[PDB]
XYZ file of C-alpha atoms in Angstrom:
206
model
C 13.072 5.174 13.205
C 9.916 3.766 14.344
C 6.694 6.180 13.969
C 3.464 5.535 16.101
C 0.416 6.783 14.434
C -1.921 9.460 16.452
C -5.228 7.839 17.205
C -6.858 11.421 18.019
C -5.476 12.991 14.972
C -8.319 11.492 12.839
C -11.094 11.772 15.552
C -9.846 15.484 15.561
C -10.523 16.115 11.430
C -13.514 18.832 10.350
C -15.294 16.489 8.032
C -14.326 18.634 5.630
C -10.592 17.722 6.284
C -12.115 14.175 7.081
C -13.131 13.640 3.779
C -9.887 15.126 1.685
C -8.228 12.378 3.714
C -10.260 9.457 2.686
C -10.313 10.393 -0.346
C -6.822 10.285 -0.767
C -6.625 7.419 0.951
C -8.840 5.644 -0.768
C -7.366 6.736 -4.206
C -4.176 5.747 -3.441
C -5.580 2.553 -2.657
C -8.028 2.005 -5.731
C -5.244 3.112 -8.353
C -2.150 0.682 -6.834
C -0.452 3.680 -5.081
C -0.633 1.905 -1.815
C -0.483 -1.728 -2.053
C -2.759 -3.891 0.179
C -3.867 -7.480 0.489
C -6.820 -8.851 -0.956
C -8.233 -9.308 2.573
C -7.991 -5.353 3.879
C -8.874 -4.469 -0.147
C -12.294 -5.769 0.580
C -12.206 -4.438 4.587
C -11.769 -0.562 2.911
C -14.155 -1.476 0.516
C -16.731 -3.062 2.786
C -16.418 0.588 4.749
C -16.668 2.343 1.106
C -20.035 0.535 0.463
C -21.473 2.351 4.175
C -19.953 5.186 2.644
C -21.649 5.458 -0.581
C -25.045 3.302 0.185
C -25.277 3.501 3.614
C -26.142 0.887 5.671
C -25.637 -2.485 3.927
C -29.248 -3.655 2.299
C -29.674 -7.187 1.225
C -32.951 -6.551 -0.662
C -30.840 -3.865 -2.668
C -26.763 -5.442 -2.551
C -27.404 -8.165 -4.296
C -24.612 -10.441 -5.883
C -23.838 -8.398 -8.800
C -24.941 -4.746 -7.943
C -21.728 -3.518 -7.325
C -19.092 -2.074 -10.071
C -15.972 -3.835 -8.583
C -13.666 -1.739 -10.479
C -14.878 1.756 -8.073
C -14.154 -0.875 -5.029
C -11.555 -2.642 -5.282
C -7.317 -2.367 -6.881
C -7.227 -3.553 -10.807
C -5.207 -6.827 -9.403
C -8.309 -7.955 -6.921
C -11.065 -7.071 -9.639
C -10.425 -11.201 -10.780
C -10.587 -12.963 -7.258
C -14.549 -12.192 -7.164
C -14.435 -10.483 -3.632
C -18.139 -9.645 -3.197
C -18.873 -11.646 -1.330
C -16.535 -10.283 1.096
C -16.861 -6.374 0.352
C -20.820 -7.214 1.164
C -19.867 -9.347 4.584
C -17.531 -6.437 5.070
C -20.340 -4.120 4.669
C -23.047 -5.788 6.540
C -20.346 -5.937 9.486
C -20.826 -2.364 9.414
C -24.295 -2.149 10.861
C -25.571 1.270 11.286
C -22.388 2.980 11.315
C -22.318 6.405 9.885
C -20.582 7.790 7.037
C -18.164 9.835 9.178
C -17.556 7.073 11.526
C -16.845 5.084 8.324
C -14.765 7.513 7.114
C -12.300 7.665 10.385
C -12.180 3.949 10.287
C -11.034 3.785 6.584
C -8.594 6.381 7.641
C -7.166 4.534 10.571
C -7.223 1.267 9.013
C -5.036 2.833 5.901
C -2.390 4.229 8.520
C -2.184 1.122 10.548
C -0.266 -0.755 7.413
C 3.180 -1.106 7.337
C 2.822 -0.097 3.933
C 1.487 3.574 4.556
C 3.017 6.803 3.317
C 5.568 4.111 0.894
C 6.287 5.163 -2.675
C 6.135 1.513 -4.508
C 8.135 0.725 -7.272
C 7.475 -3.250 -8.938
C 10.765 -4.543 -9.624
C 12.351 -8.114 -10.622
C 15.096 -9.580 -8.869
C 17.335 -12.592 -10.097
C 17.788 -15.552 -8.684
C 21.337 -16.886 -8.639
C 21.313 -19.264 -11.478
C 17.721 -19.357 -12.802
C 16.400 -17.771 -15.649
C 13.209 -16.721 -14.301
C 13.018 -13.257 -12.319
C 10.499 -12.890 -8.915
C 8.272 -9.871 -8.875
C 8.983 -7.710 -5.964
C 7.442 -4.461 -4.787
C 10.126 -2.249 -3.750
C 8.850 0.832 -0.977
C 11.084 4.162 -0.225
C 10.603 5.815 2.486
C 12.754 9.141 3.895
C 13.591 5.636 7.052
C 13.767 3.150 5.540
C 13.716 0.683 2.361
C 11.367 -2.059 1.702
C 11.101 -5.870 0.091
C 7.255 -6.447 0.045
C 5.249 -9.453 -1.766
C 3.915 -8.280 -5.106
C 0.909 -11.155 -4.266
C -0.089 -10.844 -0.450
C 1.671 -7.287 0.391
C 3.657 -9.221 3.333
C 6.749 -7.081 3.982
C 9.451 -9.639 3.525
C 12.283 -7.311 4.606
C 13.291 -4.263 5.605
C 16.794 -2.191 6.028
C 16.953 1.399 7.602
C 17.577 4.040 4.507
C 20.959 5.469 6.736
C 22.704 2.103 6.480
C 23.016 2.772 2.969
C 26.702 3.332 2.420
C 26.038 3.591 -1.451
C 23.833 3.377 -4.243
C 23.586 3.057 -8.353
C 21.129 2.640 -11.257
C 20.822 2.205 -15.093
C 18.071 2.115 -17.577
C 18.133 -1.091 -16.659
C 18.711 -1.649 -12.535
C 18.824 -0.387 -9.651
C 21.672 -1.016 -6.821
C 22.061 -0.939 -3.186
C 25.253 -1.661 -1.374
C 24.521 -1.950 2.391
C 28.272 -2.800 3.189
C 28.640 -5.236 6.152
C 25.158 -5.190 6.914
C 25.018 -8.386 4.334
C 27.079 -9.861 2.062
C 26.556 -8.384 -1.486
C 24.154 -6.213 -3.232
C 20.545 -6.060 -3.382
C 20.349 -5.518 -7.035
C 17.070 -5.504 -9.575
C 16.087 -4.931 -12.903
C 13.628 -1.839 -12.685
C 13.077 0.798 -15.937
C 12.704 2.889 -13.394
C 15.721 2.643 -11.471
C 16.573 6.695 -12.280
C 13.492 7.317 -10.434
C 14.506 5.304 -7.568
C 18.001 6.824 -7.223
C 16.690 10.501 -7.495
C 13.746 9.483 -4.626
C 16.698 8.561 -2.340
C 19.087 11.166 -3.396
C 16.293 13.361 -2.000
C 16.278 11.566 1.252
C 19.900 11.142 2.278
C 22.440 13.525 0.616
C 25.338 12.688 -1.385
C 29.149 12.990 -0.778
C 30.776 15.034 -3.506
């Protein structure tokens, strides 16, 4: 199932409402909640700056000034993006903060990667000992393989093709049946949590 995002619906927000979503939008971003790239990390942030300085001010935004860690995901804080976050900024000319605000909004909701609970797992490649990172993303459609790196969604499978599904303290386990051949199987700590977040999406024969 394939959802188009209302344009209007963030036009429409009270600023009050306006704000509660960009906040949360841009928490979910700055704490790893919602996984982006490290080019739209420094497009939000570049629209955070016009946000919280206003328009971008070169006698003032100097290399430096900013705290990257308010600005940017934990993972990002080591590439030095200033320089982009600033170009970002400056791009931003005289836009206001509520017209900042919408477009942080929109640009959140245009990702693939929107509204997906993330889960970093390891899966095993067939005959060599070292494991590939993976971000795994649940949704009530679908499942997700995304990049743990670049955020590129590598793969995806609808959640009701499912035909059945296991974990352990140590994995996690999805048999698709004849959609492919085999399982898609990782080691995850957290593969309870996975199981229970599906369990609430598609219901279980007894």
């Amino acid at each position: 199932m394939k959802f188009f995002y209302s344009d209007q619906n963030v036009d429409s927000r009270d600023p009050v409402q306006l704000n509660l979503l960009y906040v949360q939008a841009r928490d979910d971003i700055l704490n790893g909640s919602h996984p982006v790239s490290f080019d739209k990390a420094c497009e939000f942030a570049g629209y955070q700056c016009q946000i919280q300085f206003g328009p971008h001010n070169e006698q003032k935004h100097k290399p430096g000034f900013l705290e990257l860690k308010d600005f940017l995901p934990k993972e990002y804080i080591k590439q030095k993006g200033e320089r982009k976050i600033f170009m970002a900024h400056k791009n931003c000319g005289n836009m206001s903060e509520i017209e900042a605000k919408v477009r942080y909004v929109k640009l959140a909701r245009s990702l693939k990667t929107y509204g997906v609970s993330f889960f970093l797992v390891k899966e095993k490649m067939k005959g060599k000992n070292k494991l590939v990172p993976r971000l795994l993303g649940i949704t009530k459609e679908c499942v997700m393989r995304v990049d743990e790196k670049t955020k590129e969604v590598i793969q995806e499978w609808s959640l009701t093709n499912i035909k059945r599904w296991a974990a352990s303290p140590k994995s996690f386990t999805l048999d698709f049946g004849d959609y492919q051949d085999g399982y898609y199987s990782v080691q995850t700590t957290e593969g309870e949590q996975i199981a229970q977040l599906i369990a609430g999406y598609i219901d279980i024969i007894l």
